[PDB]
Design a protein around this ligand. Structure first.
Ligand SMILES: CCn1cc(CN2[C@H]3C=C(c4cccc(O)c4)[C@](C)(C[C@@H]3C(=O)OC)[C@H]2C)cn1
Length: 285
């Protein structure tokens, strides 16, 4: 047991992920060159990641001291931000996959569909949809003291009359509606996309547009794959704990889930040429 490992990971996230996501958002907002629908979805992803990053110093307290000293309102805000990030990230990735599928397999409709204004509207709709869980976490979140160890715990406060089916039902619903169905949609979309790419890879000829499409599809696929492997262990662990060394695995899964918020810019800078150019221009004008 050495507390500086996960705490150092949390601090590295708290600084680097915040800086990178802020740079991504600033670059997307400023440059008219990079105001594209996929870039708008990337902006939403970076916004969620930066929002979840600000709560990193509060997250590390329940690991350093195993108690919540920040109060009820801060507990509510932190829980709401966590649920907002979890739902918004997966929904935005699903919409990115759908947009890529439309661009690749239905170019006739993608002209009307893939305008940046529709991307902004879809981002607002995604934030509103996830608010059904964020506002619920605001209402239900709270701090309850432990009567056996005098430890303050920050968690959702289901009625103590049942507080059992409630927790299991909410965990199952979160699993189904934030992991299973969106991942199924992403898998279907990318299976069709890969089929289309293989079909025309032999003799496609619109060099500039084909290259651009294949590069953005690559970038989106890599981002989705990184998210899936970063958030897969925590979902399975939560489901197993609800239904069925353990604490070490739990905290490792939690830490791995949070590090995904910092790897998005270090992926954009390597998978996209325009993002790399803009990062260089900002760092070294
Ligand atoms: C600092 C360590 N710590 C974190 C917590 C609680 N968090 C972690 C686990 C949860 C979760 C995740 C997936 C499915 C599910 O049903 C619940 C949260 C809703 C999101 C956090 C996370 O995993 O994002 C990497 C939240 C209550 C308690 N201690």
């Amino acid at each position: 047991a050495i507390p500086v490992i996960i705490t150092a990971v949390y601090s590295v996230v708290f600084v680097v992920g915040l800086v990178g996501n802020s740079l991504v958002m600033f670059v997307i907002i400023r440059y008219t060159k990079m105001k594209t629908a996929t870039n708008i979805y990337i902006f939403n992803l970076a916004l969620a990641d930066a929002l979840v990053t600000t709560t990193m110093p509060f997250q590390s307290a329940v690991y350093l001291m195993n108690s919540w000293p920040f109060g009820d309102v801060l507990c509510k805000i932190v829980i709401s931000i966590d649920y907002y990030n979890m739902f918004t990230s997966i929904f935005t990735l699903t919409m990115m996959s759908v947009d890529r599928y439309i661009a690749v397999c239905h170019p006739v409709k993608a002209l009307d569909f893939r305008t940046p204004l529709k991307a902004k509207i879809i981002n607002i709709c995604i934030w509103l949809l996830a608010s059904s869980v964020g506002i619920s976490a605001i209402v239900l979140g709270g701090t309850k003291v432990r009567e056996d160890v005098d430890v303050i715990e920050c968690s959702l406060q289901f009625p103590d009359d049942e507080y059992s089916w409630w927790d299991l039902f909410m965990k199952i619903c979160v699993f189904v509606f934030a992991f299973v169905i969106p991942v199924l949609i992403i898998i279907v979309c990318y299976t069709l996309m890969i089929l289309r790419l293989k079909s025309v890879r032999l003799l496609s000829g619109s060099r500039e547009k084909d290259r651009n499409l294949r590069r953005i599809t690559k970038l989106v696929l890599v981002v989705v794959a990184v998210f899936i492997i970063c958030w897969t262990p925590i979902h399975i662990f939560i489901l197993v704990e609800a239904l069925g060394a353990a604490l070490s695995s739990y905290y490792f899964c939690i830490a791995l889930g949070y590090t995904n918020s910092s790897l998005n810019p270090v992926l954009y800078a390597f998978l996209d040429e325009n993002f790399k150019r803009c990062f260089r221009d900002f760092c070294f004008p």
